[PDB]
């Protein structure tokens, strides 16, 4: 027997903005210099 | 025991001192265990 997929729920897209080292602060490790804010 | 006759006598940490990626100051706290509370 094989399996097929039927979609359930959340269809959503995540544009990366920043990745920090600290818990909610600390130095910036990754910064996305492409982001165009709404 | 005062040494200089007319001057004033001279006179619970939760973080760890760690060097960060850039080279400044980073604080390391006690890790959280995910044990469920009685309440």
From Swiss-Prot, chain B:
Highest taxon above the source species: Eukaryota
Places the protein is found: Nucleus, Nucleolus; Nucleus, Nucleoplasm
Family the UniProt entry places it in: Belongs to the WD repeat BOP1/ERB1 family.
Subunit structure: Component of the NOP7 complex, composed of ERB1, NOP7 and YTM1. The complex is held together by ERB1, which interacts with NOP7 via its N-terminal domain and with YTM1 via a high-affinity interaction between the seven-bladed beta-propeller domains of the 2 proteins. The NOP7 complex associates with the 66S pre-ribosome.
Function: Component of the NOP7 complex, which is required for maturation of the 25S and 5.8S ribosomal RNAs and formation of the 60S ribosome.
Name the UniProt record assigns to this protein: Ribosome biogenesis protein ERB1
Organism: Chaetomium thermophilum (strain DSM 1495 / CBS 144.50 / IMI 039719) (Thermochaetoides thermophila)
Gene name of the record: ERB1
Shown residues in whole-protein numbering: 116 to 161 of 801
């Amino acid at each position: 027997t094989d399996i097929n997929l039927i979609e359930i729920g959340p269809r959503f897209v995540l544009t990366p903005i920043i990745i920090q080292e600290g818990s909610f602060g600390g130095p910036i490790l990754y910064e996305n210099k492409r982001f165009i804010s709404p | 025991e005062i040494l200089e006759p007319f001057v004033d006598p001279p006179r619970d940490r939760n973080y760890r001192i760690e060097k960060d990626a850039n080279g400044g100051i980073r604080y390391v706290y006690d890790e959280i265990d995910p044990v469920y509370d009685s309440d």
